[PDB]
Amino acid sequence: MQATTTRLVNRIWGEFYSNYSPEREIKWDGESLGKTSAGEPLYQQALVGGEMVAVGGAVTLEVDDPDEMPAIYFVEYMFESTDHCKMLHGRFLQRGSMTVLGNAANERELFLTNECMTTQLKDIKGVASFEIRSRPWGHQYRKKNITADKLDWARALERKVKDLPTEYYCKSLYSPERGGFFSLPLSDIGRSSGFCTSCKIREDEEKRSTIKLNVSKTGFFINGIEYSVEDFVYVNPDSIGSFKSGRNIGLRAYVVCQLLEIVPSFDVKVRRFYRPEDVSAEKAYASDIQELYFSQDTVVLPPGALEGKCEVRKKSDMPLSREYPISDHIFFCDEIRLATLDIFAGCGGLSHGLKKAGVSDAKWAIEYEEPAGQAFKQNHPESTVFVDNCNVILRAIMEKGGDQDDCVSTTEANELAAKLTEEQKSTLPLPGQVDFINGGPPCQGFSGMNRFNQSSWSKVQCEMILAFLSFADYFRPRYFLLENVRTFVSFNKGQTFQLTLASLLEMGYQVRFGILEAGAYGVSQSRKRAFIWAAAPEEVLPEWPEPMHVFGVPKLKISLSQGLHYAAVRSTALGAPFRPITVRDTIGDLPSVENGDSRTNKEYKEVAVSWFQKEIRGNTIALTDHICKAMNELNLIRCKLIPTRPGADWHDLPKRKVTLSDGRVEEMIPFCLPNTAERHNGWKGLYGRLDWQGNFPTSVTDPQPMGKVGMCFHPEQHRILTVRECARSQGFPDSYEFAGNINHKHRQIGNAVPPPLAFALGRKLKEALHLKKSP
DNA sequence: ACTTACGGAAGG
DNA sequence: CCTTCGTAAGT
Ligand SMILES: [Zn+2]
C-alpha cells in the first residue's frame, strides 16, 4: 500500500522511502541623504574594489578556522564616523545547514536572525549575490510557481559546473528562541534610516529583567509585568513556609496571596489564601475547582517570589460561561468559522474539540474503519463522511480536477478510485473551498512500545505522513495542524521529522512545532503529544495554550542544533493554579457492576458530586457503554487475591497450585513475569490496581491485565475498567456515542485526542484569527 | 477469538 | 542506573 503523493513531496523525500519515480580602495558613491541621531551623515552605496555595496545586499566577512565558511551579513545602513572612518551595520544571515533542518536544508537558502553587528567596512572579505523572495499566495498560482522553480534549479546546476559564486536568497525569519520560521517584515528592513529594529528590540529586552520601583510606591515591575497594592498574585509553595505509578500525590499548587504593603531593595507582605485540599482530600473531593478560603495569616516574602497575577471575586459576579478546560485566572470565596477537512478522523475527538471552539466546521471527513465512520456519522449528523483509504480518495480528487499527470500512485489506487459511484464523486471537495486541514496520522510506527518497528507493515504505516503532506500541497489552505506521539521528533535520529518541516518550508508556509502534555489540561491521564502548526504567509501563527493544572513532569524540550533546546511550554511540577484530577474525581459516581456485564443501556443511580463529574455529565440522563469484558476463572482468582492497597501488583500473589473446575491444575504465577523481571524493572504495574488518589495510565487500544502498561484493575472491584470509565479518563462527555462491539469501542477510545486539548488549540487559533489585519 | 511471552533507545 | 508507553505466537 504505497502512499499516493504529489511531485513536490516525492522530490523532497528522495533517496529515502519507497514509491519514488525519478521521472584596497574604498570610496563613497552618490550623495548624502541625511544624518543619524548623533549627527553623522549616512550614505547608501559604496565602491569597494570595483564592487558596489548597496543597502539590501550581502557582505561576506572573514572568520577564524579557515576550513570553515565565512559569515554573511545583510546590510542595513552605512555611515561615516566622526574620526573619518567608514562604518556599516549588518544583520547575521544563518545558513541552512546550521539550523534544526540539519541535512535536509537547501544550499542556497539563508535565514534572517535577530543578531546584528557593526564592523569596519575595510575588513569585509567581499560582496555576494542576494535577493528576497516573495510570492503571491493561492492554489491557482501553483502550476506557475513550479515552472519558475524548475528554471531556477537548472540555472543553479550550470553554475556549479562553471564554479561561479553561488546565488543566495531568503524568504523567512528563523527564531530558535520561538522555535519556528516566521514571515519576513519587509517594511522594516533595508530602510537605511539609521534605525535598526533588531537592536532596538534587543535593548528593550535587556532593559527588562531588572527590578524597578514606581513613584509614590504604587507598585513595581518584574519581568515586564506590573504588580500593585490591593491585587492578587501567585507564590511558590516551597518558597512560603514514595511513588509507584501515579507519582503525583505529593504535589501542591500556587499559593494565592494579596499584597498589603511594601516594606524594606524591598520586601513584600502578603495575606494568604487557603485551599480545600490543604484541609483533607475528602473535603476537596466535593469542592469546586476554583474555590479558596479566607484566613488572617500575613507573611513577609522577598520580591523575587512572584510568578503572575489573578483575580478573586464573589459568588454573584462570575464569567457566567462554564467553558472546559478553564483558561482564566479567577477564583471565588464567600463570522470567522472555517471549512474543515478531517483526515484520520476516527471517532472524532479532535473534530469535536475544534468545532466546540467556534472556529471550524467539518464539511468532509475521511476514515478507514467502518465502526469509526459509523461513530463519526452518529456524532456529526451534518458532515460528509468517506469510509475509504486516503490514497484512493486523493487520487479521485485529483482526477476530478484533471490533474492525473501531477500525482504518483500505484495501480491499486486507480482501480479503487474508478469504482466510486457518481453520487460520491459529486460531493467531493475542490481546491478553493477548503480553508482548514486537520488530522492525526497513524502512530504505531513511531511508538516506543513497538519492538517490531523494522518490519514491512510498520514502514508503510510511517509513510502516511507523506500522503498527509500531499493534501496540504494540493489545496493550499490557510492553516494546517499535525499531531503525533512524543517520540516522532526523535525517531530515526530525528531525520524524518526534519524532512517534514523541510517539505512545509518548500510550500511557502510558516511552521512552528511543540510538545504538550495532556495531564496539565484538566485530564487525569499522562499523555505526551507533539504538535505542528503551519500558516500562510499573510496569516498569523497561533501561540501555544498555557497549562493550568499541576502535573509532575519535567520540561519537555526538543533538541535543536549546536547544543540548543526549545521548550514550547513551561513545566508545572513546582506550581500551577489548579490542583490535579484524581480517579475518584472521574469514576467515583458510577453504579457498581460485576465482571463481564453486557447491558448497554443503564441509568445513573447517584447524583454527581465532584466538579469533574458535573462538568462531564451535564443534562444527560441515559447511561451507556458501562460494560466490561469478561475474564476466565484463572484471571478472576488472580484478581480476587490481589489486595486492595495502593501500589499492589503481581508481587503479592502467593505461590500455590490451583485446581480449576474443568479439571486442570495451574500455577498461580504466570511464569513469564519472574522469567524476565531483571531486564524490565520487575514489571512494576502488571496485574496492578488503580489508586483512588492516583491517576490513570496512558490509554491504549486494549487494556488487558498483562501488558506493557498494565494498571487496569478497579480500585475496589474484581473487574476491568469499563469503556465509559476510559472515555471519562480521556475527557469525552457522557453524550458521546460509540459503535461496534466492546473491542471496537475500546480501540476507538484509545486512538482519540482529549477534547479539552483540541478546545484549547481551537481557542488559540481563534485568537490568532481575530488578529489578522486588513489588507 | 482469546491468552501468554517480551528489545532497546531517549531523557532525567 | 531507574523510568518511559504495541506486535506476534500459541491455544
Ligand atoms: Zn542592528
Side-chain angles (χ1 to χ4, degrees):
Chain A
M1 315 90 105
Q2 283 52 57
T4 301
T5 53
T6 180
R7 289 267 140 121
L8 194 70
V9 183
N10 188 67
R11 191 244 311 170
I12 291 172
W13 295 67
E15 289 193 61
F16 189 96
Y17 273 155
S18 72
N19 196 58
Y20 166 89
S21 62
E23 288 185 358
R24 272 301 318 283
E25 68 302 16
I26 309 86
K27 68 174 316 263
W28 294 120
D29 172 28
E31 322 309 340
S32 169
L33 303 321
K35 289 176 175 62
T36 71
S37 147
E40 304 75 320
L42 45 87
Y43 289 12
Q44 202 104 0
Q45 293 215 57
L47 263 291
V48 167
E51 314 275 59
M52 21 181 287
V53 178
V55 170
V59 282
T60 61
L61 258 49
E62 181 51 47
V63 84
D64 51 348
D65 326 293
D67 57 344
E68 303 188 11
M69 293 277 225
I72 316 198
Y73 281 94
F74 165 85
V75 152
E76 239 277 353
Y77 56 83
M78 341 182 90
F79 79 133
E80 163 168 47
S81 43
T82 65
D83 308 26
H84 325 307
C85 216
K86 319 184 95 65
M87 274 336 299
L88 82 80
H89 205 78
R91 297 188 183 208
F92 180 50
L93 293 178
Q94 178 98 258
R95 215 170 289 248
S97 316
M98 310 284 123
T99 51
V100 69
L101 300 178
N103 238 332
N106 203 293
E107 256 80 36
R108 306 164 45 210
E109 184 134 271
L110 311 178
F111 298 88
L112 202 82
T113 62
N114 72 331
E115 328 209 305
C116 40
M117 70 79 156
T118 166
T119 72
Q120 199 192 132
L121 198 153
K122 176 167 20 64
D123 290 345
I124 69 108
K125 170 168 155 344
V127 83
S129 313
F130 177 74
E131 50 157 7
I132 295 190
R133 293 220 171 154
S134 67
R135 313 269 205 74
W137 184 239
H139 62 96
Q140 62 275 38
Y141 298 114
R142 276 216 327 156
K143 274 76 50 188
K144 316 214 325 213
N145 263 37
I146 84 170
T147 45
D149 279 351
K150 224 152 294 196
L151 274 193
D152 162 5
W153 189 73
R155 159 140 158 263
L157 177 55
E158 298 292 67
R159 271 185 137 180
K160 264 190 55 191
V161 170
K162 316 255 199 43
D163 205 333
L164 280 73
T166 88
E167 201 155 332
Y168 296 107
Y169 63 86
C170 168
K171 332 178 312 183
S172 81
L173 159 85
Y174 175 41
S175 312
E177 40 104 26
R178 302 177 87 194
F181 302 76
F182 296 75
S183 61
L184 273 178
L186 286 167
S187 72
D188 306 11
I189 81 162
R191 273 196 110 67
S192 37
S193 309
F195 192 125
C196 170
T197 40
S198 307
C199 311
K200 193 243 157 203
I201 196 45
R202 171 177 10 224
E203 159 214 338
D204 186 75
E205 195 259 345
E206 196 143 55
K207 185 235 70 175
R208 307 207 287 117
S209 78
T210 62
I211 314 108
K212 185 283 208 153
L213 309 90
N214 272 339
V215 297
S216 308
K217 291 320 293 138
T218 53
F220 55 97
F221 288 2
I222 294 290
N223 274 299
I225 182 64
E226 77 80 355
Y227 310 80
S228 69
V229 181
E230 222 174 358
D231 289 358
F232 305 103
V233 278
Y234 295 156
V235 162
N236 247 356
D238 295 3
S239 294
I240 174 148
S242 48
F243 287 124
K244 313 291 195 315
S245 278
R247 29 209 56 196
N248 291 298
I249 305 99
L251 301 173
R252 290 96 74 63
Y254 279 145
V255 201
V256 177
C257 286
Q258 187 193 11
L259 303 173
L260 295 190
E261 250 299 341
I262 285 145
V263 289
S265 289
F266 57 117
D267 265 30
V268 313
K269 159 95 75 71
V270 287
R271 227 194 262 150
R272 216 186 174 279
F273 272 122
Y274 278 76
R275 292 177 177 248
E277 56 302 324
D278 306 339
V279 170
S280 76
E282 190 269 283
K283 176 62 100 213
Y285 167 68
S287 287
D288 201 347
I289 193 191
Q290 53 193 9
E291 176 188 308
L292 313 182
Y293 283 148
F294 188 178
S295 292
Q296 289 281 355
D297 290 37
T298 88
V299 177
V300 154
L301 267 306
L306 293 295
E307 298 252 17
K309 299 167 43 113
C310 70
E311 336 197 10
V312 161
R313 287 192 228 189
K314 34 182 310 309
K315 273 295 288 303
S316 298
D317 308 83
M318 291 316 279
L320 164 148
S321 183
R322 305 202 58 85
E323 304 174 0
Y324 168 70
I326 298 189
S327 55
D328 40 326
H329 314 251
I330 304 116
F331 303 81
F332 70 89
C333 89
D334 75 1
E335 47 170 345
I336 71 168
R337 196 174 294 262
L338 289 133
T340 315
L341 156 69
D342 206 349
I343 310 186
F344 314 109
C347 56
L350 175 66
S351 268
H352 175 81
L354 283 187
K355 148 140 49 165
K356 199 200 169 183
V359 61
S360 151
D361 73 5
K363 267 203 171 189
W364 309 274
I366 305 163
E367 188 39 56
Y368 198 7
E369 41 211 11
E370 284 271 283
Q374 200 59 261
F376 199 99
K377 200 88 196 69
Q378 261 147 234
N379 285 285
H380 307 280
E382 309 291 348
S383 291
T384 307
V385 182
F386 297 91
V387 185
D388 263 287
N389 178 53
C390 305
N391 296 358
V392 316
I393 296 290
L394 193 50
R395 188 39 141 83
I397 283 195
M398 287 183 191
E399 248 155 39
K400 198 182 182 175
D403 281 314
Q404 49 266 38
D405 49 81
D406 197 20
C407 78
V408 173
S409 53
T410 36
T411 40
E412 294 59 357
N414 318 339
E415 281 163 23
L416 257 72
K419 293 186 183 177
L420 294 184
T421 193
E422 298 327 270
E423 294 251 17
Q424 313 198 240
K425 293 203 148 242
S426 76
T427 181
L428 288 163
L430 270 167
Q433 309 170 22
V434 187
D435 293 344
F436 192 13
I437 292 183
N438 87 3
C443 76
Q444 288 86 29
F446 317 115
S447 197
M449 329 207 264
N450 185 350
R451 57 195 203 73
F452 292 103
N453 62 76
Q454 303 283 352
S455 70
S456 286
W457 163 247
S458 281
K459 296 203 189 86
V460 313
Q461 293 267 121
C462 292
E463 272 163 26
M464 287 330 267
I465 306 268
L466 299 209
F468 201 25
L469 289 182
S470 289
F471 266 92
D473 183 32
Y474 191 66
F475 286 87
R476 298 286 170 113
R478 296 168 56 192
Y479 287 89
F480 174 81
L481 189 53
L482 215 176
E483 179 255 26
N484 225 285
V485 287
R486 200 273 262 270
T487 68
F488 163 72
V489 309
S490 323
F491 174 78
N492 204 354
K493 253 101 70 174
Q495 286 191 347
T496 84
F497 170 61
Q498 288 167 357
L499 283 168
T500 300
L501 296 182
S503 288
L504 290 171
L505 278 206
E506 184 92 57
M507 276 162 234
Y509 275 111
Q510 327 166 60
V511 200
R512 81 175 321 173
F513 33 85
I515 289 171
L516 300 162
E517 149 94 350
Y521 292 104
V523 161
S524 77
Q525 157 198 178
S526 178
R527 210 181 181 86
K528 311 190 203 324
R529 307 290 158 176
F531 296 89
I532 290 186
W533 268 121
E538 299 294 328
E539 318 284 319
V540 170
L541 266 180
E543 306 284 80
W544 297 109
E546 185 185 78
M548 329 268 305
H549 283 266
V550 38
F551 213 76
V553 166
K555 264 194 177 189
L556 313 159
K557 60 204 45 161
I558 305 187
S559 164
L560 306 162
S561 266
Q562 331 286 31
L564 287 102
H565 306 292
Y566 171 67
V569 295
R570 77 183 201 97
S571 188
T572 167
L574 272 306
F578 302 129
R579 66 164 222 268
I581 321 277
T582 66
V583 316
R584 210 210 254 277
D585 295 347
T586 305
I587 67 158
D589 199 25
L590 306 180
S592 65
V593 316
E594 273 197 53
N595 175 45
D597 216 345
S598 41
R599 198 160 62 258
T600 285
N601 265 87
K602 294 169 184 166
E603 333 182 49
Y604 295 88
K605 210 63 217 90
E606 311 278 38
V607 306
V609 176
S610 97
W611 171 91
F612 187 88
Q613 285 157 18
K614 291 180 170 76
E615 196 76 27
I616 213 64
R617 230 163 94 169
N619 302 328
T620 297
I621 49 100
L623 192 35
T624 324
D625 292 274
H626 191 28
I627 46 144
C628 54
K629 38 176 179 177
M631 297 190 274
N632 48 9
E633 321 181 32
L634 191 37
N635 291 334
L636 244 194
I637 297 172
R638 283 160 174 160
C639 188
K640 284 262 181 45
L641 290 177
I642 293 299
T644 77
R645 165 190 67 237
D649 58 20
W650 70 277
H651 285 295
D652 310 13
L653 280 198
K655 211 190 48 45
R656 91 181 54 158
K657 327 189 54 61
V658 279
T659 294
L660 297 183
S661 178
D662 168 44
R664 288 156 326 124
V665 280
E666 301 268 24
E667 284 271 20
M668 176 98 44
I669 324 282
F671 164 79
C672 82
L673 309 184
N675 188 24
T676 314
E678 309 309 310
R679 320 172 215 162
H680 307 103
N681 224 28
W683 298 106
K684 175 184 262 84
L686 278 285
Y687 274 83
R689 287 198 187 264
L690 285 202
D691 215 298
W692 274 135
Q693 290 304 277
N695 73 270
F696 284 84
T698 282
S699 311
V700 288
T701 71
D702 202 17
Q704 42 108 12
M706 196 196 308
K708 270 178 184 174
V709 175
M711 276 267 132
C712 71
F713 275 168
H714 198 268
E716 91 202 357
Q717 295 159 31
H718 317 302
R719 57 164 197 85
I720 313 269
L721 308 165
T722 72
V723 186
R724 172 57 56 184
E725 288 163 328
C726 294
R728 289 191 155 186
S729 86
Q730 273 256 79
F732 282 93
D734 265 359
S735 314
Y736 217 75
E737 279 157 325
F738 306 100
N741 53 52
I742 210 182
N743 291 14
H744 293 151
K745 291 156 174 177
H746 267 312
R747 172 129 164 121
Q748 283 161 26
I749 300 267
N751 267 2
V753 183
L757 205 40
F759 187 70
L761 297 187
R763 255 187 29 92
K764 275 315 172 170
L765 174 64
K766 171 144 153 170
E767 216 156 85
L769 226 38
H770 269 313
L771 224 35
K772 161 99 165 303
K773 69 164 41 64
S774 295

